Ligand binder design. Sequence first.
Ligand SMILES: CCO[C@H](C(=O)NNCc1cc(OC)c(Br)c(OC)c1)c1ccc(N2CCOCC2)cc1
Ligand SMILES: [Mg+2]
Ligand SMILES: [Zn+2]
Length: 313
Amino acid sequence: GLMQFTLPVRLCKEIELFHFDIGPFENMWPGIFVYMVHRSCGTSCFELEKLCRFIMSVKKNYRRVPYHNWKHAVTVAHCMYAILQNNHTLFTDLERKGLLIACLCHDLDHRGFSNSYLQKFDHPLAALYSTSTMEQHHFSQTVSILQLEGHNIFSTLSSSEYEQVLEIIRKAIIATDLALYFGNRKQLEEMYQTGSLNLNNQSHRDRVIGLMMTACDLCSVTKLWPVTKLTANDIYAEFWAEGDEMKKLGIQPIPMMDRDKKDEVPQGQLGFYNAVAIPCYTTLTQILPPTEPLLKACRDNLSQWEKVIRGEE
Ligand SMILES: CCO[C@H](C(=O)NNCc1cc(OC)c(Br)c(OC)c1)c1ccc(N2CCOCC2)cc1
Ligand SMILES: [Mg+2]
Ligand SMILES: [Zn+2]
């Protein structure tokens, strides 16, 4: 009950900033997550015994792939912690509870392959979940872990709070399917600009939480340049493996996934910042003004990829 996690001084300070990197020490990541849940939610939100057992089972169900791994899960959870901490009064108790868990679980059992590759391979998950294939799997895996003896961190919720929190998590995890982000953002953009955006309207809140999920999921583009540039290597390591696996099915992959087309990456990065990242953090910042540091960092990284193209690095 009276047992806080405490971090060394430098982490205690920098964990509060959007651009925090969780570090190369894997054994500190469970503690960093519990710290964030205690400050975001409270010491009371979860039985520590049950939370620790949940965290360790989630970690076991992330695979040893270059990007869609345990480090990504915790990184995406930290970006949500920082949004939630800078927007204290906008979010219910259930939402703070659900959203940190959803971010931790949102890529559970990822194999390093897109929804597209599962469909072309004719993977069994693609027959079972014809859209948002991996994300429906990630939610399926979150529910399975929650039902292991000892792992039900929501045990002290009432029956209807429990239904609400699993519904928050389901929607939050489905929204990390980037194919859905484009229309979600367009709708939020119209709503904000015509002044119809209403955070008491559940369907509106759902959309705002979806955009928060995309912003957290993409948050490697909001880090200091050296972190963003080194993370891009892991992201492309997966893309190029999937490219190779497309060529093995006798499909020419898109250039982004072709390791023979590495020279095209810096221009690919501009496309990605201008069509996905910048607009995501721009709309987020219009809806949640204190998340402006994520947009400012994203703009700095765009300017760094511009320098790469101009051979200034
Ligand atoms: C099967 C690949 O699909 C990915 C995806 O669904 N997510 N991409 C995530 C991603 C994250 C990221 O950093 C956190 C970086 Br850097 C990144 O780099 C490309 C991609 C995707 C990549 C580029 C686009 N373009 C981009 C150009 O405009 C249309 C959409 C659309 C989808
Ligand atoms: Mg995902
Ligand atoms: Zn993710």
